[PDB]
From a paper:
Central to the replication cycle of influenza viruses is the viral RNA-dependent RNA polymerase which transcribes and replicates the viral RNA genome. The influenza virus RNA-dependent RNA polymerase is a heterotrimeric multifunctional machine composed of polymerase basic 1 (PB1), polymerase basic 2 (PB2) and polymerase acidic (PA) subunits, that catalyzes both primer-independent replication (vRNA to complementary RNA (cRNA) and cRNA to vRNA synthesis) and primer-dependent transcription (vRNA to mRNA synthesis) in the nucleus of infected cells. PB1 houses the polymerase active site, whereas PB2 and PA contain, respectively, cap-binding and endonuclease domains required for transcription initiation by cap-snatching. High-resolution structures of the complete viral polymerase from a number of human, avian and bat influenza A viruses, as well as influenza B, C, and D viruses have been determined. These structures have revealed that the polymerase is a highly flexible macromolecule that can assume a variety of distinct conformations, enabling the polymerase to perform both transcription and replication that require different initiation and termination mechanisms.
Author numbering:
A (entry chain A): 1 to 716
B (entry chain C): 1 to 249
C (entry chain B): 1 to 185, 207 to 756
D (entry chain F): 1 to 121
Write the structure that this text describes.
RNA sequence: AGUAGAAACAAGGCC
RNA sequence: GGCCUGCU
């Protein structure tokens, strides 16, 4: 039958009908009479629509061939011959522009004169039944319907026929051409009734070929095919198989509970080796401040001018000389770098306006100090294979180092009060609710407690230094840059003040990965002699740069004044995390506020004021040789703030591992102290897990010592 | 006019012609998401790192013909170098602030009508009345509650057809909404937003947010009302209760 | 006196101050170089935990595979992957018996979803291993490349737009003699059957960074695109199953997890009378993923899908069949340094099979020597067990089956147990009349776990009396206690954009106040610090200050120009009006009534060249990877302002041979923008159909010109011009 | 009713420090905003500074930024003011004040209810 | 040298 | 010496 559509109809219509065939997903080889019927429907749609044009009037202009002009409007514009999505697109667009009603089924054409749709259907059966059939299929329709049938008859409601009658003679001539051409073909044994509305399909997902063999190799050891295994599974029913293997399984497979008593836990062993060194990016306990007493705010001002003005406030400069060498570098380079920094600072002082940011010369001194041109050149393996020295990067456990007493004192003095306010908080919306007033009062109390704390000063120092370093690295990637360490505080009298700890020289910072390292050299003034705790300054070079006179009742001290100079490095991640050190304030004060709220849930009243003023209640916050010492809530605030600050400063994988594996043991010990009969399956394994995190970090070793002390004081 | 004209210009060049011809409508989404740009793992680190560069943000090419290349002192506002995989050009953040001090101005009177949810929140809070804070242990029990206080009793898909018919009336397809509540919602949000020119996509998104009901599991103590859950952070705490009555009531 | 914070625990219980034990204020550990060492170590460890299995050689991939299932029962407490098929089938049968109709229903909904799912659902995924280029690429890019290759090779069933048809094409590709791929350096290369099989069965290995809570780094894996559809269907089934199990806690959030934990502890302890003792085990499973054999997941799913259409069973079984034969790419490689000659070199991992061992240290030398026998075409066969939690939900199902197997109806003894399982972590409440009963119950639970290939970490687990325990960093002590140290890293600028960052910060403060019991004063301090960091990050200072920045001039002139300066946004150098009462309001709407109409109009102008919206999914959704958890998405309330710009892209593609991808990106985006202008609903609802672009665009041009004349700007001249231009593009597409 | 006194007034050399003080009674001191206005000899008064009921939102004149600090104490019902590095032309009589609204920004900044007994030169 | 820690950075590539 | 890139 398909030979007929090969022969007669034009290409355009046959591929339109083929795409309509693909539309609903049925195959053309099984039933083709539908293809012919609907392609004839589509053909009558065209032949009825084309050759029919309109101009600004009604009364369509009919031309056998559209002449070249702007007057190519089509009388009837076709609906079908398009995908369902576009057919409904045209339906909705016509409804929204023509203000007509939206039909629920697919029309075939639209006309302007009568401003409505045409649903053309030419069926094998006579018209006077198919018409009202499709009419009762369509609900309350104003779209006019018109149908032909092979006998040659026409019909329509309203007795309406919308265009010329010679066109309809055309239609029925086409119709009988179709008819008495099948006459030569002979199809009416099924042509009248060949489609009955079949819609059914079964989804087929068959495993075959290579993928089947893979299925045959992904079974238990004693199975040969997926078919057999699935049959076995379907036939499988529970018949007490877990019990049999449990009985047969060796009894050494057990989870015996070892009781956890007061005498069970042993102190954590600390590693032994050379004392632990300093790792901070700046001096914490041994910092010195040169000040100007200016009225500018933290960010307000220009760095270089402030630094120069602060440094001019000090008199007593001496020619620098080596006091304590780096022990691994070239100290003369550090000396020359310091003198170069001074010289270029003067050079800025001379000229017209202090630059906002200064670049330094790339001398051999800072070329060595900043580690320039030291990365091995990257080459290909095929060119370097016979080199005996060629091997992997050194990948082994870090060097072992024992704890020293300097970190303990540094933390002790990091929780001490100061003679300045190191936090100038921002603005918030004016409090409107009583709860907001309570929150503001609490916040004011904590700010009064923690602002005068060395932890806040360290927070500001780190934030400013890391912000400046990151910005300089991102801006001046190539050229070495000078950045004075600046921090602005407020005195007890209320006068604002600036403080200059020293200088940082940032080097080449072409940082691609988050782990890539930018090297800088840090110089900081101090008065602490490095000849008393040399092991804490393994990586520092310390010079003697001047003498300071601070008013004291013992005449006047006239102390020496040294310069701690070192080469340090950071990374994008480290800079970003060090510039978010202000969340240590959060951590600490959230803990304290949780304490206050928990206690106030007992007594139905806010308990902040008496906690902060009466200072009757105290918490164990340290141990003295006499015994455990307790301090007021403010001291707890400062201690927790210092702990968070040191966590942010000495952060490392060792800290995370020890924190987790020691929190586990802390929970076990707490369960013991709560009389909850705690038990363990392998306590030695937990101890070994904790002890492997303690390698060389001073902070984690101090935490381990604190944990041992807590165990000793606990378990009683 | 224009649209078909850049269509013809695209089809003029062979590669885009092939892309238009062989690519089917269904694959639309795939090729639209086809990109070499990986999704950032650490957005904060790079936002703090990129903002230290010059020309850290991106803007459409049209910026080159509305904002001058430099400001009064000569600080550059935009660059003509296009982004990696787009025709947009990289520009400095000042071009934002500049646009807020001398850029073109319009009538933003209809934004309150579009962003109905946020302005309703503001109105509800502005007329609220606070009360005394009572300090006592709160037994916070976890419950499933509806957070959206303006949901019109419609699901995501249920209101999606409404949203299309309100914004994209022609792409609705087969669906013609039966429920009369949807009829009235369509009528109201059609006559209300008849000429709003913010964007079809944002209008649809905000209509989805407003009409679609959404639910989440939260620790609550008292309240349980939609209007009382948006301020759950302000009325309920660990050991304090703050009596509150939104402006709606 | 020496200060010691830990001594604070002598007065404050450990859980009431547990936040102090979370050093989440410093930089988390990161990996620096290759992850090849970790990948090799994981492969060797997975293979040696199942050493007593039986060896075979796959006839298709030619790789050695180790099957430990039904192997000898363990005789020691060391980890073992010798799961027994009959035991696990019986466990699943008991799970079904205790929950009748679970499998049949879940299979019904899964069948519905599978037969109505679309291909585009695969684009909604993070990095995936594209085999066309042998590298990780965004899910959409890899899917597009694979579809292009399939269409070039003759597999065009995916044009039906159905994920099931895409999987049919994927499987049909397995039986092809020779496929063709494209490489740029374009060159067409031919892949034989075995090479393509291994490329489709392989995984890409990387090192996990930003992982807090352990000293050593780990390795993670990413599969290809051929196997992700089957994984999607299997995980859909597993999620539908677990949603019907109250003992599971994987498909829920955190608060739901806490609620279920409280309910189970109350149920276990309350029902226990005075005579019965109760004990809670806070258990962690050692080597959870390395001991889960994909064959056992195949067994579980084929038991689940019994009495179901065979096509459903086949499509759900394809995934574990491929995992059982999965291969793993070793990794980036190894970098060597020579200090004598002062140079460095980078050898790819694919050379580990043949490269001499003189360059490697003792540990790496031994690892390579042990893993070499499993090396096939630069990748190692990893049949014995899963690599990194790809089947999270099925593992949770197995754990829930174990938990339910002690409902006192199967124990047949006075003791019994229950609890909650979330993959790699569990809480087990066991009750028994005497300590001997508790010991016997825990021993039998451990033994049954060892029969299913699941091991309990004795070093990271402990048992106490009920009332105090831990679960996924949630510490329960007669009621869950807030931590607030897990969410600390999320208190900074997110890094999306100005408005997005502001809204996300305020919303995070609000949420942590609601959930994590953040205090009022602490919340105010957090708001202040966040505002400070936000202003210092975006160079948007108050405007009344003299802080010179790259943006302080325009901000200052805008400040001096504005009359009501209280309405200026913090992004434009205005005061901050936020407070505890205003944390749930966007900044634009909070300052709407205070803004000057000129500034208000300039700010919220639709014609701004900065705002760009792509799809309904990416309107106000921000992907923030939370600390100590999987990547998560958040809805943030924000108004589309001129500050909603999107930041610059990487731009490093210009120096790589893969430079043509940018031109393809630009052309695809131009075509997509044209289509959207032709089809406005393209973004909100993704278009569907089987026609091509130009057909729809030209036909809609026809119709829209027509109707927009029937009322609108068009004119006959223009309408006819459009009609004949449509004809012109038609004949152009003809040729 | 409204009661406002002054203190600390006294002659002083330039470039020196000084601290003023005030006092209130008859109303909720922690519920209303304050300002400081000064009348120079032969010149109308103008505003100097403002402050809110929280102690948080402070502003200043254009010509005295960084040299004047303002701070209140609700408990003792006072309102301090510290001026350092005083300019020569700063010599004049200073007048306390009391806003009506709690905030500061809304409305124009001008004195409404006070009397400036205190002075300085 | 320095950062850092089971492998890396201490710029890369292209002419 | 000149130019390109900074998660590809």
């Amino acid at each position: 039958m398909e030979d007929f559509v090969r022969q007669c109809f034009n290409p355009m219509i046959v591929e339109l009908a083929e795409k309509a065939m693909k539309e609903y997903g049925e195959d053309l080889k099984i039933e083709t009479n539908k293809f012919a019927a609907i392609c004839t429907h589509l053909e009558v749609c065209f032949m009825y629509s084309d050759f029919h044009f309109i101009n600004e009037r009604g009364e369509s202009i009919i031309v056998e061939s559209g002449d070249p002009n702007a007057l190519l409007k089509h009388r009837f514009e076709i609906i079908e011959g398009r995908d369902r999505t576009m057919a409904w697109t045209v339906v909705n667009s016509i409804c929204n522009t023509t203000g007509a009603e939206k039909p629920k089924f697919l029309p075939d054409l639209y006309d302007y004169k009568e401003n409505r749709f045409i649903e053309i259907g030419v069926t094998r059966r006579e018209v006077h039944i198919y018409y009202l059939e499709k009419a009762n299929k369509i609900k309350s329709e104003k779209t006019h319907i018109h149908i032909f049938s092979f006998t040659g008859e026409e019909m329509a409601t309203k007795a309406d026929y919308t265009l010329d009658e010679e066109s309809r003679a055309r239609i029925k001539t086409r119709l009988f051409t179709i008819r008495q051409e099948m006459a030569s073909r002979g199809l009416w044994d099924s042509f009248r009734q060949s489609e009955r509305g079949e819609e059914t399909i079964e989804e087929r997902f068959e495993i075959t070929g290579t993928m089947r063999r893979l299925a045959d190799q992904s079974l238990p050891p004693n199975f040969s095919s997926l078919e057999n295994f699935r049959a076995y599974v379907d036939g499988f029913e529970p018949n007490g198989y877990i019990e049999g293997k449990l009985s047969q399984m060796s009894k050494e497979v057990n989870a015996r509970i070892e009781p956890f008593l007061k005498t069970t836990p042993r102190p954590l062993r600390l590693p032994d080796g050379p004392p632990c060194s300093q790792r901070s990016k700046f001096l914490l306990m041994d910092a010195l401040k040169l000040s100007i007493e200016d009225p500018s705010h933290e960010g307000e001002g220009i760095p270089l001018y402030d630094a120069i003005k602060c440094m001019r406030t000090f008199f007593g400069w001496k020619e620098p000389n080596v006091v304590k060498p780096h022990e691994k570098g070239i100290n003369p380079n550090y000396l020359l770098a310091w003198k170069q920094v001074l010289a270029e600072l003067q050079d800025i002082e001379n000229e017209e306006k202090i630059p906002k940011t200064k670049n330094m010369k790339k001398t051999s001194q800072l070329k060595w100090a900043l580690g320039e041109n030291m990365a091995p050149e990257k080459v290909d393996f095929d060119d370097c294979k016979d080199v005996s020295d060629l091997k992997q990067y050194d990948s082994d456990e870090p060097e072992l180092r024992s704890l020293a007493s300097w970190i303990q004192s540094e933390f002790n003095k990091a929780c001490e009060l100061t003679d300045s306010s190191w936090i100038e908080l921002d603005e918030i919306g004016e409090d409107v609710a009583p709860i907001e007033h309570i929150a503001s009062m609490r916040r004011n109390y904590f700010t009064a407690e923690v602002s005068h704390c060395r932890a806040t000063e360290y927070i500001m120092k780190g934030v400013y230094i890391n912000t400046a370093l990151l910005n300089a690295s991102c801006a001046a990637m190539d050229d070495f840059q000078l950045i004075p360490m600046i921090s602005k505080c407020r005195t007890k009298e209320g006068r604002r003040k600036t403080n200059l700890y020293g200088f940082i020289i940032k080097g080449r910072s072409h940082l691609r990965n988050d782990t890539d390292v930018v090297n800088f050299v840090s110089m900081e003034f101090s008065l602490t002699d490095p000849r008393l705790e040399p092991h804490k300054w393994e990586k520092y070079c310390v010079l003697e740069i001047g003498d300071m006179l601070l008013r004291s009742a013992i005449g006047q001290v006239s102390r020496p004044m040294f310069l701690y100079v070192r080469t340090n490095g950071t990374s994008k991640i480290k800079m970003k995390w060090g510039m978010e050190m202000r969340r240590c304030l959060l951590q600490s004060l959230q803990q304290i506020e949780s304490m206050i709220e928990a206690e106030s849930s007992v007594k139905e009243k806010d308990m902040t004021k008496e906690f902060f003023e009466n200072k009757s209640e105290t918490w164990p916050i340290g141990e003295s040789p006499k015994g455990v010492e307790e301090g007021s809530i403010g001291k707890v605030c400062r201690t927790l703030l210092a702990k968070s600050v040191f966590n942010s400063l000495y952060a490392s994988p060792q800290l995370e591992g020890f924190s987790a594996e020691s929190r586990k043991l802390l929970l076990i010990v707490q369960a013991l102290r709560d009389n909850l009969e705690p038990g363990t399956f392998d306590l030695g394994g937990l101890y070994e897990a904790i002890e492997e995190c303690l390698i060389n970090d001073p902070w984690v070793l101090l935490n381990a010592s604190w944990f041992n002390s807590f165990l000793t004081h606990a378990l009683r | 006019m224009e649209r078909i004209k850049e269509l013809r210009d695209l089809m003029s060049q062979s590669r885009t012609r092939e892309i238009l011809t062989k690519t089917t409508v269904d694959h639309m989404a795939i090729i639209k998401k086809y990109t070499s740009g990986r999704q950032e793992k650490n957005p904060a680190l790079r936002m703090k790192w990129m903002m230290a560069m010059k020309y850290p943000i991106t803007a459409d090419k049209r910026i080159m013909e509305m904002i001058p290349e430099r400001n009064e002192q000569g600080q550059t506002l935009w660059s003509k170098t296009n982004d990696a995989g787009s025709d947009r050009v990289m520009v400095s953040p000042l071009a934002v602030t500049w646009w807020n001090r001398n850029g073109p101005t319009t009538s933003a009177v209809h934004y309150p009508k579009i962003y109905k949810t946020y302005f309703e929140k503001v109105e509800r809070l502005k007329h609220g009345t606070f009360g005394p804070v009572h300090f006592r242990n709160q037994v916070k029990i976890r419950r499933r509650v509806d957070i959206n206080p303006g949901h019109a009793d419609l699901s995501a898909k249920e209101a999606q057809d409404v949203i299309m018919e309100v914004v994209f009336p022609n792409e609705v397809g087969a669906r013609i909404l039966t429920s009369e509540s949807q009829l009235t919602i369509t009528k109201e949000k059609k006559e209300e937003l008849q000429d709003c020119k913010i964007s079809p996509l944002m209008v649809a998104y905000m209509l989805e947010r407003e009409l679609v009901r959404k639910t989440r599991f939260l620790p609550v103590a008292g309240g349980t009302s939609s209007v009382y859950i948006e301020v759950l952070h302000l009325t309920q705490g660990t050991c304090w209760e703050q009596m509150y009555t939104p402006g709606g009531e | 006196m020496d200060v010691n914070p830990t001594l604070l625990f002598l007065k404050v219980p450990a859980q009431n101050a547990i936040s102090t034990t979370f050093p989440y204020t410093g930089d988390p550990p990161y990996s620096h170089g290759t992850g090849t060492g970790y990948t090799m170590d994981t492969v060797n460890r997975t293979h040696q935990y199942s050493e007593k299995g039986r060896w075979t050689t796959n006839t298709e991939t030619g790789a050695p595979q180790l099957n430990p299932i039904d192997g000898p029962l363990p005789e020691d407490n060391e980890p073992s992957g010798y799961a027994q098929t009959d035991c696990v089938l019986e466990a699943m049968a008991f799970l079904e018996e205790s929950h009748p109709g679970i499998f049949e229903n879940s299979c019904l909904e899964t069948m519905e979803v599978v037969q109505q799912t679309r291909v585009d659902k695969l684009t909604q995924g993070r990095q995936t291993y594209d085999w066309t280029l042998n590298r990780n690429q965004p899910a959409a890019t890899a899917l597009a490349n694979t579809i292009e290759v399939f269409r070039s090779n003759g597999l065009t069933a995916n044009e039906s737009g159905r994920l099931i048809d895409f999987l049919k094409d994927v499987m049909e590709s397995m039986d092809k003699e020779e496929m063709e791929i494209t490489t740029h350096f374009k060159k067409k290369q031919r892949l034989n059957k075995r090479s393509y099989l291994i490329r489709a069965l392989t995984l890409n290995t990387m090192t996990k960074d930003a992982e807090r809570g352990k000293l050593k780094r780990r390795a993670i894996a990413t599969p290809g695109m051929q196997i992700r559809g089957f994984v999607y269907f299997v995980e859909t089934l597993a999620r539908s199953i677990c949603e019907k199990l109250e003992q599971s806690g994987l498909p829920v959030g955190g608060n739901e997890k806490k609620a279920k934990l409280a309910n189970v502890v109350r149920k276990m302890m309350t029902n226990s009378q005075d005579t019965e003792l109760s004990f809670t085990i806070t258990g962690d499973n050692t080597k959870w993923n390395e001991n889960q054999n994909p064959r056992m997941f195949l067994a579980m799913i084929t038991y689940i899908t019994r009495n179901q259409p065979e096509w459903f069973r086949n499509v759900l079984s394809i995934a574990p069949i491929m995992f059982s034969n999965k291969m793993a790419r070793l990794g980036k490689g190894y970098m060597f340094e020579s200090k004598s000659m002062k140079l460095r070199t980078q050898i790819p991992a694919e050379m580990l099979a043949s490269i001499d061992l003189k360059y490697f240290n003792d540990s790496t030398r031994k690892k390579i020597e042990k893993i070499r026998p499993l090396l096939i075409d630069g990748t190692a066969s990893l049949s014995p067990g899963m690599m990194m939690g790809m089947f999270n939900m099925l593992s949770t199902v197995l754990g829930v089956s174990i938990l339910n197997l002690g409902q006192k109806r199967y124990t047949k003894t006075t003791y019994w147990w229950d609890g909650l399982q979330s993959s790699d972590d569990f809480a087990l409440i066991v009750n028994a009349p005497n300590h001997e009963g508790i010991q016997a119950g825990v021993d039998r639970f451990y033994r049954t776990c060892k029969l299913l290939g699941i091991n309990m970490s004795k070093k990271k687990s402990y048992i106490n009396r009920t009332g105090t325990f831990e679960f996924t960093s949630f510490f329960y002590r007669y009621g869950f206690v807030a931590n607030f140290s897990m969410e600390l890293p999320s208190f900074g600028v997110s890094g999306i954009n100005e408005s997005a960052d502001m809204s996300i910060g305020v919303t995070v403060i609000k949420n942590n106040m609601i959930n994590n019991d953040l205090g009022p004063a602490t919340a105010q301090m957090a708001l202040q610090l966040f505002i400070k960091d936000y202003r210092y990050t975006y160079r948007c200072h108050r405007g009344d200050t003299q802080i010179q920045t790259r943006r302080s001039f325009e901000i200052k002139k805008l400040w001096e120009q504005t009359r009501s300066k209280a309405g200026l946004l913090v992004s434009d150098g205005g005061p901050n009006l936020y407070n505890i009462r205003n944390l749930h309001i966007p900044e634009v709407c909070l300052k709407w009534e205070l803004m000057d109409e000129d500034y208000q109009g300039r700010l919220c102008n639709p014609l701004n060249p900065f705002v760009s919206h792509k799809e309904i999914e990416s309107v106000n959704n921000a992907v923030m990877m939370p600390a100590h958890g999987p990547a998560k998405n958040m809805e943030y309330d924000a108004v589309a302002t001129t500050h909603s710009w999107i930041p610059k892209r990487n731009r490093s593609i210009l120096n790589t041979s893969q430079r043509g991808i940018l031109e393809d990106e630009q052309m695809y985006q131009k075509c997509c923008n044209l289509f959207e202008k032709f089809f406005p609903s393209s973004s909100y609802r993704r278009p569907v159909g089987i026609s091509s672009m130009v057909e729809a665009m030209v036909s809609r041009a026809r119709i829209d010109a027509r109707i927009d004349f029937e009322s609108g700007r068009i004119k006959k001249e223009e309408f006819a011009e459009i009609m004949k231009i449509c004809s012109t593009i038609e004949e152009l597409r003809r040729q | 009713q409204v009661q406002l006194q002054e203190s600390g007034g006294g002659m002083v050399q330039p470039g020196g420090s000084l601290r003023l003080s005030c006092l209130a009674s008859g109303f909720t001191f922690s519920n209303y905003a304050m300002t400081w206005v000064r009348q120079a000899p032969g010149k109308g008064p103008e505003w100097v500074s403002m402050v809110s009921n929280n102690g948080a939102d402070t502003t200043y004149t254009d010509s005295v930024k960084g040299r004047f600090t303002i701070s209140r104490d609700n408990a003792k019902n006072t309102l301090y003011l510290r001026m350092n590095n005083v300019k020569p032309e700063d010599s004049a009589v200073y007048y306390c004040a009391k806003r009506r609204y709690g905030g500061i920004w809304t409305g124009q900044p001008t004195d409404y209810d006070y009397l400036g007994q205190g002075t300085v030169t």
